[PDB]
Amino acid sequence: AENVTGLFKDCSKIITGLHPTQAPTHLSVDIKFKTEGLCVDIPGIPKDMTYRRLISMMGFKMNYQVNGYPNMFITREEAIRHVRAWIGFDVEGCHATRDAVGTNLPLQLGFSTGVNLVAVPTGYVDTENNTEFTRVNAKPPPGDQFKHLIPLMYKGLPWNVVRIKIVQMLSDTLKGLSDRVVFVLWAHGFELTSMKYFVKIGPERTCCLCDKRATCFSTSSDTYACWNHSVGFDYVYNPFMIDVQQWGFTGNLQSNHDQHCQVHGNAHVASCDAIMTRCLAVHECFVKRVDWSVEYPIIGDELRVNSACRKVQHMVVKSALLADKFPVLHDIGNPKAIKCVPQAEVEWKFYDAQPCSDKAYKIEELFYSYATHHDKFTDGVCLFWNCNVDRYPANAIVCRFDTRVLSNLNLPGCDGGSLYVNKHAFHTPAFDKSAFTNLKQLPFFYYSDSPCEYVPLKSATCITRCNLGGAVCRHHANEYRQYLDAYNMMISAGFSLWIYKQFDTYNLWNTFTR
Amino acid sequence: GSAGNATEVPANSTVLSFCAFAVDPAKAYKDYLASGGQPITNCVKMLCTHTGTGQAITVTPEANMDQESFGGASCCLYCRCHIDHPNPKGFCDLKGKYVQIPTTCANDPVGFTLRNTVCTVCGMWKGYGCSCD
Numbered sequence: 001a002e003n004v005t006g007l008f009k010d011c012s013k014i015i016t017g018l019h020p021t022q023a024p025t026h027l028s029v030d031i032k033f034k035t036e037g038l039c040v041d042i043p044g045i046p047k048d049m050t051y052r053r054l055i056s057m058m059g060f061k062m063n064y065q066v067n068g069y070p071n072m073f074i075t076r077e078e079a080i081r082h083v084r085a086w087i088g089f090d091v092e093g094c095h096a097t098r099d100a101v102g103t104n105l106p107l108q109l110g111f112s113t114g115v116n117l118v119a120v121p122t123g124y125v126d127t128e129n130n131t132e133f134t135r136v137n138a139k140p141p142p143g144d145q146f147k148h149l150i151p152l153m154y155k156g157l158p159w160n161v162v163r164i165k166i167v168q169m170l171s172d173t174l175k176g177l178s179d180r181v182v183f184v185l186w187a188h189g190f191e192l193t194s195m196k197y198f199v200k201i202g203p204e205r206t207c208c209l210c211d212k213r214a215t216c217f218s219t220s221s222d223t224y225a226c227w228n229h230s231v232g233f234d235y236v237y238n239p240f241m242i243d244v245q246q247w248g249f250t251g252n253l254q255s256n257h258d259q260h261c262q263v264h265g266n267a268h269v270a271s272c273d274a275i276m277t278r279c280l281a282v283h284e285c286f287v288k289r290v291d292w293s294v295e296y297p298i299i300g301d302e303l304r305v306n307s308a309c310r311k312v313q314h315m316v317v318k319s320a321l322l323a324d325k326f327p328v329l330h331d332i333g334n335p336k337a338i339k340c341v342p343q344a345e346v347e348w349k350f351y352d353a354q355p356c357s358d359k360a361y362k363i364e365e366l367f368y369s370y371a372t373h374h375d376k377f378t379d380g381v382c383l384f385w386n387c388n389v390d391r392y393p394a395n396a397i398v399c400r401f402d403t404r405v406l407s408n409l410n411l412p413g414c415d416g417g418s419l420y421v422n423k424h425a426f427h428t429p430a431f432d433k434s435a436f437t438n439l440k441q442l443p444f445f446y447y448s449d450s451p452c453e454y455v456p457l458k459s460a461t462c463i464t465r466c467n468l469g470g471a472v473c474r475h476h477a478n479e480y481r482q483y484l485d486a487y488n489m490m491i492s493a494g495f496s497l498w499i500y501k502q503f504d505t506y507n508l509w510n511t512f513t514r
Numbered sequence: 515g516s517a518g519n520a521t522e523v524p525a526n527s528t529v530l531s532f533c534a535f536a537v538d539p540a541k542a543y544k545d546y547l548a549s550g551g552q553p554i555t556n557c558v559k560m561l562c563t564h565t566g567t568g569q570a571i572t573v574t575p576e577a578n579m580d581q582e583s584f585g586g587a588s589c590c591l592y593c594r595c596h597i598d599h600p601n602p603k604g605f606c607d608l609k610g611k612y613v614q615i616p617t618t619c620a621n622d623p624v625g626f627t628l629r630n631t632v633c634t635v636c637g638m639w640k641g642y643g644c645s646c647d
């Protein structure tokens with residue numbers, strides 16, 4: 001007897017602390033004051049007038065239940081519900097060599113965002129009057145692999161700066177994306193410890209002069225801040241975090257990351273570590289395919305993009321059917337019947353890896369790979385609409401997401417692929433030209449077969465309902481305008497259209513014969 | 515590598531971790547008590563003559579048959595969690611002086627120092643009690 005933390009372990013090199021007053025604990029008061037499991041005041045042996053004792057912040061170990069106070073560690077489930085509130089977090093650190101030993105200071109912080117913030121080594125030092133938060137002498141870890149940390153000692157930066165820069169850097173990243181923060185970390189101990197600097201915690205609060213829950217806090221003048229409308233805010237009111245390693249991974253992080261994703265090589269920089277942590281969380285959760293019970297609220301204008309997406313789908317597959325008159329259509333990646341063109345003579349076959357249970361009688365359970373299936377559908381046309389695959393067959397109509405475009409919808413992923421979120425987040429592979437080698441790009445066009453009915457405009461590109469004249473026909477002239485807008489919307493949404501090369505704009509004209 | 519001197523027992527970990535991060539440490543503590551969590555222990559307890567003034571702040575331990583005596587710093591929450599003191603600049607009252615608590619209320623010495631204020635006239639606990647007012 002008895003066990004000790006050590007948390008707030010006294011790291012000073014002083015023998016013989018500490019007077020029973022100005023002693024934080026019974027554990028340290030000099031043996032001289034201790035008798036019979038107690039302490040006793042001896043006026044003769046004085047309390048120190050001046051002393052500086054480094055107190056270790058390591059081993060924070062916080063698990064607690066208080067009604068008004070939110071658990072800051074969350075279930076794997078709850079961590080999926082909020083994604084890209086996700087930020088990878090890892091802190092390289094330093095040891096205090098000179099006037100103290102046995103604690104680790106937070107030298108360099110890094111995030112899923114490319115940013116790295118380096119700080120002056122600082123710590124908490126107990127003194128006669130109070131506890132003070134101050135710069136401390138410190139040294140780099142011993143290893144030759146840690147040799148890269150040395151210069152960072154000098155470079156920067158005051159913590160009052162860093163904790164303010166941290167917020168803004170998180171602020172403009174998460175402003176539109178989420179209401180909160182979740183920290184994704186591999187081995188959580190030191191980052192929890194690092195968190196002590198820029199984080200204050202407490203019961204939930206609403207943004208000053210704003211409706212949404214408060215992410216940030218300001219010591220300057222007490223205030224509770226929104227993600228968007230905060231500025232000049234030092235502290236983060238209610239972060240969340242999840243320790244990936246808690247998930248039962250076998251080895252070290254790098255091994256597990258590199259197993260799946262090759263787009264991140266490793267430089268020991270804290271960021272490159274904090275990114276790797278995210279790939280794993282991403283991959284482990286989201287390369288499992290399309291759990292459909294998860295609802296992420298949307299902002300913004302995905303509904304428009306969603307409608308536009310389907311709208312343009314109908315147009316192109318209807319025409320492509322008209323023009324080249326395919327006997328059968330293989331629709332791959334259609335979990336539900338849902339014919340895009342409801343009425344067509346064509347044989348319509350559905351294929352899916354994860355067909356929806358009800359309405360699963362129509363669909364063949366299949367996983368498409370060009371290697372195996374290049375032979376297997378020779379007949380008619382194949383449709384992959386947002387079904388991302390091994391390179392596409394020569395006869396096809398495909399809509400694919402180009403991961404390279406950034407919009408608040410798509411988030412980084414593994415490897416080089418972006419995890420796309422409109423609803424029901426879909427992880428999609430990195431955009432690859434080689435995949436389209438059998439196809440050709442799809443030029444914009446409009447098709448309407450309808451009886452015809454603010455300034456009019458002439459479009460060379462379309463099949464107009466009437467081309468005999470100019471010919472601006474008030475129904476089409478307006479519909480063409482509205483369709484093109486919904487087409488330009490989804491092409492700006494990052495989607496790209498690819499068609500079999502046989503396809504020709506002309507052949508739609510012969511449908512205007514009589 | 516520790517490589518250091520351990521100042522704390524595990525039984526106080528969560529509470530101290532909790533109040534350290536909190537914006538209001540004082541509330542967090544009182545709240546934590548309500549939740550059924552244990553009051554902070556390990557505070558320094560004085561073997562005393564128990565004859566002396568009942569005064570709360572004393573340069574040497576002064577106790578009563580009713581009171582018990584504690585080293586001030588160990589009874590102060592802000593000293594204990596190593597966070598800034600509510601006095602704007604910068605100083606703690608209890609550190610460097612011995613502090614006395616009613617034995618019945620002595621179970622949670624840390625909170626007692628938070629809840630109450632000493633009367634300026636006799637320099638003694640208010641209500642626990644005071645001839646003043």
Ligand SMILES: C[S@@+](CC[C@H](N)C(=O)[O-])C[C@H]1O[C@@H](n2cnc3c(N)ncnc32)[C@H](O)[C@@H]1O
Nearest residue numbers: 333334335352353354355366367368385386387
């Ligand atoms: C393609 S996405 C959503 C796009 C959908 N086709 C649309 O246009 O609404 C979801 C479906 O893709 C299918 N999928 C993805 N990869 C597949 C593959 N290699 N083979 C077959 N189906 C695949 C899944 O089985 C899943 O049901």
Ligand SMILES: [Mg+2]
Nearest residue numbers: 090091187190
């Ligand atoms: Mg780490």
Ligand SMILES: [Zn+2]
Nearest residue numbers: 207210226229
């Ligand atoms: Zn706001």
Ligand SMILES: [Zn+2]
Nearest residue numbers: 261264279414
């Ligand atoms: Zn990666």
Ligand SMILES: [Zn+2]
Nearest residue numbers: 590592593606
């Ligand atoms: Zn104090």
Ligand SMILES: [Zn+2]
Nearest residue numbers: 633636644646
């Ligand atoms: Zn009085």
